Amino acid sequence: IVDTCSLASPASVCRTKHLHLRCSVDFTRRTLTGTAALTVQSQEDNLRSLVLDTKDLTIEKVVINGQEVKYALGERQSYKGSPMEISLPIALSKNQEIVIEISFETSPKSSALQWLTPEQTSGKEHPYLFSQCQAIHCRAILPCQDTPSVKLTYTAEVSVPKELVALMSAIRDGETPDPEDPSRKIYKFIQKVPIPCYLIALVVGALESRQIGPRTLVWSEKEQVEKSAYEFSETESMLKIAEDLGGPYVWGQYDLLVLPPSFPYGGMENPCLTFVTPTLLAGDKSLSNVIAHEISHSWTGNLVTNKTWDHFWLNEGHTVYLERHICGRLFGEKFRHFNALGGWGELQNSVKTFGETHPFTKLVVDLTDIDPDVAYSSVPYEKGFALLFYLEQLLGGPEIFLGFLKAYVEKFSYKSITTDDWKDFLYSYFKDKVDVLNQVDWNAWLYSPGLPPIKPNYDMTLTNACIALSQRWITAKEDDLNSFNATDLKDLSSHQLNEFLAQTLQRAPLPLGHIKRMQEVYNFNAINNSEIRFRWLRLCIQSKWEDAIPLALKMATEQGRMKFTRPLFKDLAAFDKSHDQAVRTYQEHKASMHPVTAMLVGKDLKVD
Numbered sequence: 218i219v220d221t222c223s224l225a226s227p228a229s230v231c232r233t234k235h236l237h238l239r240c241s242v243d244f245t246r247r248t249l250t251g252t253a254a255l256t257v258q259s260q261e262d263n264l265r266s267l268v269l270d271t272k273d274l275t276i277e278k279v280v281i282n283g284q285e286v287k288y289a290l291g292e293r294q295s296y297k298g299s300p301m302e303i304s305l306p307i308a309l310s311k312n313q314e315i316v317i318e319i320s321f322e323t324s325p326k327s328s329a330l331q332w333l334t335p336e337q338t339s340g341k342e343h344p345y346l347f348s349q350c351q352a353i354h355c356r357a358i359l360p361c362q363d364t365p366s367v368k369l370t371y372t373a374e375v376s377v378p379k380e381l382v383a384l385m386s387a388i389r390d391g392e393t394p395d396p397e398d399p400s401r402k403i404y405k406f407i408q409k410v411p412i413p414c415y416l417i418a419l420v421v422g423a424l425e426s427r428q429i430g431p432r433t434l435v436w437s438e439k440e441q442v443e444k445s446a447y448e449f450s451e452t453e454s455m456l457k458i459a460e461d462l463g464g465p466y467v468w469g470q471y472d473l474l475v476l477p478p479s480f481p482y483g484g485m486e487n488p489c490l491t492f493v494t495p496t497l498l499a500g501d502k503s504l505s506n507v508i509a510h511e512i513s514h515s516w517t518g519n520l521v522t523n524k525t526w527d528h529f530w531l532n533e534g535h536t537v538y539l540e541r542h543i544c545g546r547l548f549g550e551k552f553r554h555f556n557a558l559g560g561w562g563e564l565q566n567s568v569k570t571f572g573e574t575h576p577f578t579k580l581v582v583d584l585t586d587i588d589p590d591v592a593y594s595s596v597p598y599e600k601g602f603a604l605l606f607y608l609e610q611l612l613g614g615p616e617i618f619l620g621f622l623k624a625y626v627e628k629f630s631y632k633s634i635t636t637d638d639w640k641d642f643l644y645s646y647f648k649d650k651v652d653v654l655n656q657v658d659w660n661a662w663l664y665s666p667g668l669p670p671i672k673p674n675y676d677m678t679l680t681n682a683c684i685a686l687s688q689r690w691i692t693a694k695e696d697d698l699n700s701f702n703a704t705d706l707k708d709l710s711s712h713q714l715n716e717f718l719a720q721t722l723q724r725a726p727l728p729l730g731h732i733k734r735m736q737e738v739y740n741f742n743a744i745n746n747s748e749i750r751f752r753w754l755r756l757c758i759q760s761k762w763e764d765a766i767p768l769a770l771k772m773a774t775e776q777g778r779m780k781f782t783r784p785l786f787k788d789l790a791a792f793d794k795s796h797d798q799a800v801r802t803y804q805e806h807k808a809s810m811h812p813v814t815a816m817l818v819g820k821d822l823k824v825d
């Protein structure tokens with residue numbers, strides 16, 4: 218197996234067993250300066266040199282056995298960064314190990330980091346830093362074998378201003394005043410469980426905590442600590458359910474971190490410290506499905522990981538499957554089917570957006586000369602789940618397939634696998650149903666673009682109310698607009714209301730009078746629920762309602778979740794009345810946007 222996203226030496230040549238990170242965080246220069254001690258094991262005889270992944274890194278020196286050795290940075294290869302060859306002071310035999318201390322310093326243009334000014338935070342007093350290494354941004358923080366095929370434990374000592382707090386994707390290991398600087402603190406961290414390097418995370422800021430479980434603290438600025446602790450109160454309940462589905466939780470502590478609005482994703486599953494968007498603070502725990510998702514990743518993604526990014530569906534596909542199983546335990550089987558069916562609708566949207574023949578709509582992709590951030594979508598999430606949901610109904614139901622999953626997690630625990638690894642074990646587990654498995658169009662499910670060859674069976678109980686009301690609006694005439702009222706939503710949950718907008722959005726645009734009437738009777742402008750508002754504003758913009766232009770521009774910039782920001786900007790760019798505003802608003806905010814988010818929105822707006 219070849220990782221076409223990495224320029225480092227493959228796992229067949231050498232493997233990094235441990236990392237010791239000793240660095241200091243300079244907010245004045247916006248740089249990370251320190252040393253990275255990599256314990257590397259040779260996988261072949263007579264190993265004299267190895268290559269590492271770097272990206273906008275400044276290398277001072279390389280120390281092995283107390284003496285400096287010769288190193289060389291090759292030319293940059295765009296998004297992959299610059300390869301770093303290191304000359305070993307001794308030829309290594311197989312399984313032989315050495316420790317390599319690399320003195321490095323990050324660039325302010327680190328694609329893995331976003332530096333926030335005090336004004337960009339809640340407290341307005343202190344600066345802020347958070348990392349995002351998924352998929353291949355860890356090289357922009359430190360020199361490494363930036364590949365998920367290599368797992369590694371790590372320890373870290375991080376120096377930050379004494380009035381600030383540092384947190385990493387590891388177990389907290391005490392804090393002390395910096396002996397070299399009285400104005401700073403040193404936070405120590407330890408990760409005893411081997412992780413892929415993309416799971417390395419760091420956050421520095423005026424953070425506070427509040428315990429909500431025996432092994433869970435919620436971290437954020439003081440302004441959001443209390444709201445977050447309430448919003449995520451179901452965390453421990455979800456952990457207990459997840460443990461019952463995938464086996465014991467092996468990370469010891471599961472803390473949550475609520476980041477500033479510019480956090481690119483809904484959630485990052487960093488071990489011991491899950492990163493989440495503040496747009497989950499709906500006030501009624503209604504977006505806690507994301508928490509169940511990130512929790513589930515502790516088994517599918519963190520324990521059994523994809524060997525390359527071509528098999529990324531292994532991570533999210535199974536994780537969504539566990540996620541919706543957790544919500545199934547909490548709110549019933551009909552609720553699980555509700556989210557499952559809605560997820561198919563999301564798959565419909567992604568395929569239609571890319572194209573029926575677009576390579577990014579394949580379950581297993583080919584990221585050769587392809588920036589992973591560009592290819593990222595809901596396809597591996599939903600098509601992956603669609604396959605597993607299809608296999609569930611095909612092999613005897615949920616209880617039986619949940620048996621496979623637990624065996625699957627235990628079989629490939631602490632290991633990196635491929636799709637064929639998964640498929641072979643599937644046939645191995647269900648050996649008495651190989652005739653059933655052979656009826657599966659594997660080539661279409663795994664390697665063919667567009668919608669899956671077959672649609673799973675979904676319960677329609679909670680969805681019927683959505684379809685009924687949406688069809689009313691879509692097929693509505695002018696003398697049907699008056700009969701609409703606020704009573705139409707009396708028996709609709711927040712999820713049903715959101716699905717209603719999702720269904721209606723698929724047939725956008727609607728007549729402008731329909732949308733105006735909809736605001737008059739439903740008052741959707743008053744809803745702060747990010748998911749509901751996002752689809753409501755998209756419906757308005759696509760239906761050419763100029764009144765929603767400042768509202769869409771506001772939400773697109775007051776938060777940075779690419780799930781919301783990117784479709785909002787594109788819709789605003791497709792609307793002639795707001796095209797100039799959209800491009801201008803982007804240009805005025807791009808310097809302060811997340812580096813990855815700023816790049817992608819630029820491509821979407823075609824202002825690159």
Ligand SMILES: COc1ccc(Cc2ccccc2)cc1
Nearest residue numbers: 351352526529589590592593594
């Ligand atoms: C969340 O950060 C990322 C970005 C990109 C990838 C790679 C990928 C994307 C889509 C389909 C298959 C593989 C993985 C993680």
Ligand SMILES: [Zn+2]
Nearest residue numbers: 510514533536
């Ligand atoms: Zn995920």
